[PDB]
């Protein structure tokens, strides 16, 4: 059911899309027959770009699976799948943690903006290594900065009453600490057996509309709240946070209706000895 908020979040991952496949190194890749794995594909941006990338390809020459732990997810690629034609992709309901797919048969498996979700990192490390085939390459990304936290700040400071709020640092490592750091990132893919792991930071600057900004922070209010604010401030000012957001929003950015964001991800990638 909270598959219309991945719709808003959608039109900002597919800004981190391409950066991901070029990074893979899929574009020039001499493996075959190429099998690719959409890990954790939420809407499927990633398997989007790689339909758009690997237009000119003969489309017999790869094939596409797209997993994710949610059942409304894989639905909606699904009928993606079926409303574009892609004859060579198929979805399925996974746990990135432990796959069930044959070891030794994927030449490339993507997980965009999905690790930090993880329970068992390592795990879900393993597994993507055992499904690759020698000299295959897992390519990730995790979110190190992402600029709504901070106009969300602006908003609740604004609230009449000195409320605790998040730094980047503090929300980001609030689940898996350290992977928005492209140095314990590229650590950990080493420590799981990849080799010639890269890390890397790569930022966007896009503009988001105000309805939009409003749409994503919503349903993480109740996270922070929980997580940084006692209970009697829960209990006293959570229905303050949302009315504040939209009066702060259209106060600041109303004569266009557009935010200026800046987001950042570590990228990384690693490869199965051989
Ligand atoms: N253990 C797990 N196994 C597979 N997918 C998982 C998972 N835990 C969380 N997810 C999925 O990970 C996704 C994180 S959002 C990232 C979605 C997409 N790759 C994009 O770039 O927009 C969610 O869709 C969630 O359903």
Redesign the pocket.
Known sequence: GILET?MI??KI?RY??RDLIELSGLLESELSPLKLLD?????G??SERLHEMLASKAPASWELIC????AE?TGHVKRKIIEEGWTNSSARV????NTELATAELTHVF????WT??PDTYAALKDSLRILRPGGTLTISTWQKTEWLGVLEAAVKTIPTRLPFPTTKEFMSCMNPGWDDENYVRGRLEEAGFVHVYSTTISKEFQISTADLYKIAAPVIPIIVSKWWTTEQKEAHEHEILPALAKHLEATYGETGLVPQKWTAVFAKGEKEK
Request: with cysteine.
């Open positions: 991945y979040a959608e991952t981190f899309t890990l954790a594909c939420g809407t941006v990633v997993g994710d732990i949610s997810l996974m746990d990135a943690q997980a965009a903006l999905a979700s993880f």
